[PDB]
Design a protein around this ligand. Structure first.
Ligand SMILES: Oc1cnc(-c2ccccc2)nc1
Length: 182
């Protein structure tokens, strides 16, 4: 509908796949080469389905901060025959608050879904399903089951992936440039 939705659509059309684990179907963001991200509660194993194709997981790393606190991001390297467009230059370099963000989801349940969530707060600490979690972003939108892995963007930045909600607010794990230095 406007330039925020334009940027979000451009990310969805080229840098997402549908990932399936034993814990469900997730929006999965491809960042560069064969490297993607997914919420840690997806419980990625040795094999994952990518757009309903059986795919070997070459590596999976559940990220924690230097205090050994959960960040809820798993970085996955996929045994895929094709690279993602490199979008690392759209990742923020520091923790921050944002205006006018969009949450975008693409699954069997929610195809081509876009949500203007408005202002995004650097919330920080969240007890997420009983698990202390850091670097959480918060938006005052009543997100539902099926949105986990959804991409949070502003114009020109990919800032996080949806990991949960309390029925009134939604929560995303930050994406930082420093997670994807090679
Ligand atoms: O037919 C409907 C189904 N689901 C939703 C929906 C609303 C908020 C978050 C996610 C999804 N809306 C309408």
């Amino acid at each position: 509908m406007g330039p925020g939705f334009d940027f979000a659509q451009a990310i969805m059309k080229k840098n997402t796949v549908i990932a399936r684990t034993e814990k469900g179907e997730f929006t999965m963001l491809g960042v560069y080469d064969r490297v993607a991200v997914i919420p840690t509660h997806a419980s990625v194993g040795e094999i994952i389905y990518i757009n309903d194709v059986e795919t070997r997981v070459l590596d999976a790393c559940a990220l924690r901060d230097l205090t050994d606190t959960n960040l809820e991001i798993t970085i996955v390297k996929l045994d895929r025959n094709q690279k993602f467009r490199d979008i690392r230059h759209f990742l923020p370099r520091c923790e921050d608050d944002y205006n006018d963000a969009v949450l975008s989801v693409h699954t069997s349940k929610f195809p081509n879904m876009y949500i203007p969530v408005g202002q995004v707060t650097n919330y920080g600490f969240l007890n997420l399903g009983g698990t202390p979690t850091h670097r959480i972003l918060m938006y005052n939108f009543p997100t539902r089951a099926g949105q986990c892995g959804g991409v949070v963007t502003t114009t020109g930045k990919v800032i996080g992936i949806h990991v949960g909600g309390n029925g009134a607010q939604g929560f995303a794990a930050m994406l930082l440039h420093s997670y994807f230095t090679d």
